[PDB]
Amino acid sequence: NFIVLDKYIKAEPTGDSYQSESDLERELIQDLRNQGYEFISVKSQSAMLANVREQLQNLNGVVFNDSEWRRFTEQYLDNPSDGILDKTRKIHIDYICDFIFDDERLENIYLIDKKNLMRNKVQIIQQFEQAGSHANRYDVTILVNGLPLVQIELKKRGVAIREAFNQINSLFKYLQLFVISNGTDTRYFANTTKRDENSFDFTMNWAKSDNTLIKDLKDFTATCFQKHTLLNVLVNYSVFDSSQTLLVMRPYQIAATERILWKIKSSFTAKNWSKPESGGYIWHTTGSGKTLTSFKAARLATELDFIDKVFFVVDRKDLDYQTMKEYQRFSPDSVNGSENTAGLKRNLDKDDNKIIVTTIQKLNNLMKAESDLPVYNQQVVFIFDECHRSQFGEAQKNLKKKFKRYYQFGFTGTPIFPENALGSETTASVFGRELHSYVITDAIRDEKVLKFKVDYNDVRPQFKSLETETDEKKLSAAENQQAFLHPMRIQEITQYILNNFRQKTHRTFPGSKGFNAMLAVSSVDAAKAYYATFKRLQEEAANKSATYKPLRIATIFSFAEISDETFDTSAMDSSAKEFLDAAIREYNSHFKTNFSTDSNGFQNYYRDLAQRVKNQDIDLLIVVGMFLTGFDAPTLNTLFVDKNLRYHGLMQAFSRTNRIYDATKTFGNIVTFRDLERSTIDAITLFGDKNTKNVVLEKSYTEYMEGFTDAATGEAKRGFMTVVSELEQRFPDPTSIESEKEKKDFVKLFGEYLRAENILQNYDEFATLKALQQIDLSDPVAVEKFKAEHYVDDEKFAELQTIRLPADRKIQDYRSAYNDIRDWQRRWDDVVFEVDLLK
Ligand SMILES: Nc1ncnc2c1ncn2[C@@H]1O[C@H](COP(=O)(O)OP(=O)(O)OP(=O)(O)O)[C@@H](O)[C@H]1O
Ligand SMILES: [Mg+2]
């Protein structure tokens, strides 16, 4: 029974008042009651404890006496030193408690029955009446076996769900899933032990298998809140990893997973194994959670008792710190960039183990070397997470040859079509049918990935002919000090990056954390040239001004469309080797670490560097092919490109910036120093329809300045200059306040201003416009600096002075007034303050 429905009929309103929180709550409780959720009246933690006692006793076929129960409570269930983290761990891992009764016998007491879900007892309660007058806080808590695992916060129809989210006894530490609703929109998100919380962007709507949203509370309840559905989401489709972070799977992920599982069961039952028709593939756009989903799918696949072994296969190219840190718990030291099959062979012979994590390289090697493995004759499941074409063909040939009974499943954001095939077989031919799909279109619609802002930066007349070169032969022949690597070109590019880095990364505003960036270059010589030029120029600027703060720059490359670079550094030539050695030397000098250039030390360098780019310890990372595919860094907002990128390689490269973070990150920045427009549009069109480019790619500076109309619902979006104009006209401060109507309009309009400027900071033209506002005067000398740096003609310079912007003081006044109106509203339904932007 799929918990993500292929077909669902939208439920009809009752006709009764749906306006207030009490209405939503009343109909919610009634609905749940009709779905098998018993409503118990429980007004206290003592009552809760009594109920938990009864439900656990019933579940485990056991009986506590007051002393025994008090002990179980104090030691396991309710111990005071337990936090949210401890309860989450207890639910997902430690849920079995070995308990010694007073008569000294030992029994295993389950909090949840994970093998049979429907045996678990589900109930609902409502909020406690507390004390003197504050209120409202209308909530409904879903208890599993007495444990308060789910919390639904309710708001009235008018309230914007986003602001409601922004607004926010030991047993409630057990809360796993949160749900929030105004009844029009219902959004769920995981409970967290963080010390830095997630944002609204991570909250998810429930949906059907075609990814179409399910919004209103009635349908959310009729679908997501079905006991089978809900309990599956809590138990099977929630992830508690080695980072001890709770991740609730988005609907498309669950759909893909359960469709794979059903596919395996059906293929086994029919003895249809070892064909493409016994397998499947999953198309999930880059950045949509393929790793999490595929891995969870493998894990669940091990729970099929007819399946002997489950391979989870990844590319070393797609590896980073957290992933390798995670896989350690399953197949220790068997997952790395080496060619060694020893760890893999040890995993194969490991008792009480099904799951086997490995790399496509190691798997291919094993299949070549070993003729008759026992596992060849077993019941096998292969789960491939984004495995590039490099070793994949050969590995597939050997796989088809040696493995007798198998079900193989692909996971990719960029399937192999005939169009982009390039020597490789189509995904469809390899894996057979497509079990599920979540396209870049749906992903942008659901705001689970970021759009692209792609610009070819053309300030360089001398090299423009080269950067725009279509011919592939000329392109290939142009990499050298004569054409592409020309010192002037490299110098200009580097200088641009140095000048605009803080702008593109949102480090502009004073006291802003911001983001970091990557630089994808064409070759090893390109990496050398760029690193050297960056060093030189940063030194020069440091000598010019004492206040200048340098950007920490690292680089990584190996021997080696994106060419796979191995982890063996012996394959490199002496010059590249020397440069890498020096770079790693400086990396060591600054970060006070010791990394050698031998394969092990270089792998350590890879991992540590990954972690340091992820946490922003490194400002700019220069790579050739590395960290362009599977690398996950939510705080990386910009990809600088001087490289030839086509199709799948282009999508994967650009997608390093696509991860959602918060309102501060509007989209990914792709700044290209060769013209990628045709390549971009071709790629996007291949992975979507003809219209996909009008979704994925951001709008123009002119559009955001003067306003534009969105194709989807026809919503006319006001321009930045219109917002400014109306701010000056209708509210030139402080006297627009105190009145409440004017307060509301000001909040709305200035909200639009904030979002608009936040979007506009990524545009070079806006950067130029804002830079023009110092200057002065004259002092020319002050003009030629600005013009040469911002690449501005006398004509353009003359025009830019016509443009009239509010003073910094007026903007700060608006921001403080905004802050005060925000602080005033604690003690207006549809209004949403921008919380992240004010931070
Ligand atoms: N259900 C979820 N809840 C919260 N966060 C999620 C969820 N699924 C994915 N993420 C986050 O989204 C980011 C991308 O996930 P992941 O690395 O699996 O993407 P991917 O599609 O495998 O990567 P790529 O396509 O770039 O190789 C990660 O930082 C992950 O924590
Ligand atoms: Mg992945």
Residue numbers in the entry: 13 to 180, 192 to 583, 593 to 859, 873 to 884
Relevant lines from the article:
Type I RM enzymes house these activities in a multisubunit complex having ATP-dependent translocation activity that pulls thousands of duplex DNA base pairs through the stationary enzyme, eventually cleaving at random sites distant from the recognition site. Upon identification of an unmethylated specific DNA sequence, two HsdR motor subunits, which bear the endonuclease and ATP-dependent DNA translocation activities in the fully assembled DNA-HsdS-HsdM2-HsdR2 complex, start to translocate the duplex DNA toward the stationary enzyme from both directions, producing two extruded DNA loops flanking the enzyme complex. The X-ray crystal structure of the HsdR subunit with bound ATP from the Type I restriction enzyme of E. coli plasmid R124 revealed four structural and functional domains forming a planar array: one nuclease domain of PD-(E/D)xK type that houses three endonuclease active-site residues and a QxxxY motif common to the RecB-like nucleases; two RecA-like helicase domains of SF2 type that use ATP to translocate duplex DNA without unwinding; and a C-terminal α-helix-rich domain presumed to contact the HsdS-HsdM2 methylase. ATP bound between the two helicase domains was found unexpectedly to also contact Lys220 of the endonuclease domain, suggesting a means by which nuclease and translocation activities might communicate.
